[PDB]
Amino acid sequence: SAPANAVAADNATAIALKYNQDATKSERVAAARPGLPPEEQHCADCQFMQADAAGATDEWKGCQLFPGKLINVNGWCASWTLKAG
């Protein structure tokens, strides 16, 4: 079951960010962002990802651009940025 504080596909911010719970279904390939091949981009290795957010699970983390909510560790958004930190 997905947390109640999970980002909905129909969420304004989600639509603006072009975020999708399942990265294999995102347009990450067409976006082609620097860092690594799109085929390998997902929330899991994103700079903005935070296993800080409360209620975070193994499949669900917090996201700096999504305060108060949780994203799918296997999701993706047009804002992806290779994790260094």
- Position 60 contacts ligand SF4 (CB under 6 A): no
Q: Which residues are annotated as a binding site?
A: 43, 46, 63, 77
- Position 46 contacts ligand SF4 (CB under 6 A): yes
DSSP H/E element including 30: helix 28-31
- Position 63 contacts ligand SF4 (CB under 6 A): yes
Neighbour count for residue 59 (Cβ, 10 Å): 14
Q: Which of 20, 53, 70, 75 binds ligand SF4 (CB under 6 A)?
A: 75
Phi, psi of 6 (to 5 degrees): -85, 140
Q: Which of 6, 53, 70, 77 binds ligand SF4 (CB under 6 A)?
A: 77
Phi, psi of 39 (to 5 degrees): -45, -10
